[PDB]
Design a protein around this ligand. Structure first.
Ligand SMILES: CCCCCCCC/C=C\CCCCCCCC(=O)O
Length: 135
């Protein structure tokens, strides 16, 4: 099936330069501190033309469901209403674009074996967050 390497659960293992990106996004001090501490678990399932990503943490539990190439409305974990689309780059890579009125966030997720690397870019600032596959 499609995106089969994404399927299952993933837990954040490492984060590099993430404060630079939320700072740039205008995220509140207090939510930024939570964002620099919590280690979420992310679950992907693929059900038809649709992928679902569930994010679970002590802060918030959050889900989104999408068709590739199809714009949709999203509220981010920090509370911003954004227009997003997720594009399929390959069976092992997808790119999510989130457009708020102040900024645009590009989130690339690429699976390589037991690592999902998530690259987050807002203008000229980039963060990389590595997730390990669970079980
Ligand atoms: C990883 C998101 C869950 C963290 C919740 C705490 C609040 C985070 C603040 C701003 C998030 C906006 C930046 C985009 C996050 C996606 C990155 C990812 O999947 O690891």
């Amino acid at each position: 099936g499609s995106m089969s390497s994404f399927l299952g659960k993933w837990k954040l293992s490492e984060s590099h330069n993430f404060d630079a990106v939320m700072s740039k996004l205008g995220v509140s001090w207090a939510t930024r501190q939570i964002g620099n501490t919590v280690t979420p678990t992310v679950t992907f399932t693929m059900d038809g033309d649709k992928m679902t990503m569930l994010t679970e943490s002590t802060f918030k539990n959050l889900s989104c469901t999408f068709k590739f190439g199809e714009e949709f409305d999203e509220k981010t974990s920090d509370g911003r209403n954004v227009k997003s689309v997720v594009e399929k780059n390959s069976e092992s890579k997808l790119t999510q674009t989130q457009v708020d009125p102040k900024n645009t966030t590009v989130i690339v997720r690429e699976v390589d074996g037991d690592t999902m690397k998530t690259t987050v870019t807002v203008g000229d600032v980039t963060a990389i967050r590595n997730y390990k596959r669970l079980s």
